[PDB]
């Protein structure tokens, strides 16, 4: 399924994922697309920072959802 990750530049990247993918794995796919190390990525959805060990389906993230990426140092 398809999800979107919007960065603070307004750049929107699109991701191929499955509901069972971890947040860790989503950040690995972001790294593949932008060269951003996973430890620097905060992913935001429904007013929360998403925990690496949990899955998309744990957060009820459906296809076409937008995550927001905010980086740290």
């Amino acid at each position: 399924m398809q999800i979107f990750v919007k960065t603070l530049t307004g750049k929107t990247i699109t991701l191929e994922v499955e509901p069972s993918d971890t947040i860790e794995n989503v950040k690995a796919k972001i790294q593949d697309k932008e060269g951003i190390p996973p430890d620097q990525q905060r992913l935001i959805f429904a007013g929360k920072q998403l925990e690496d060990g949990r899955t998309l389906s744990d957060y009820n993230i459906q296809k076409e959802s937008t995550l927001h990426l905010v980086l740290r140092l």
């Binding site: 935001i44 959805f45 429904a46 007013g47 929360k48 920072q49 937008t66 905010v70």
Partner: protein, 76 residues
């Protein structure tokens, strides 16, 4: 929980800003929100219309005044 606590941090931040700058358009407050996102990322999903609605609650509750296309705090 996260969004809500950080929205409170943003409001405090904006009141100080308004106290010093006297007034602020919706658009400048939005630009301030987008910069603030780096400090509290739980606000990342808030868009311009949602910010407007948030500021309008404050206007209804008389914590902001709106006229001349800009927001102001009541004089203190």
């Amino acid at each position: 929980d996260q969004k809500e606590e950080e929205l409170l941090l943003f409001w405090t931040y904006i009141q100080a800003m308004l106290t010093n700058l006297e007034s602020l358009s919706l658009d400048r407050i939005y630009n301030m929100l987008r910069m603030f996102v780096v400090t509290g990322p739980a606000l990342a999903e808030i868009d311009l219309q949602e910010l407007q609605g948030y500021l309008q609650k404050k206007v209804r509750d008389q914590q902001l005044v709106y006229s001349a296309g800009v927001y102001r705090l009541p004089k203190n």
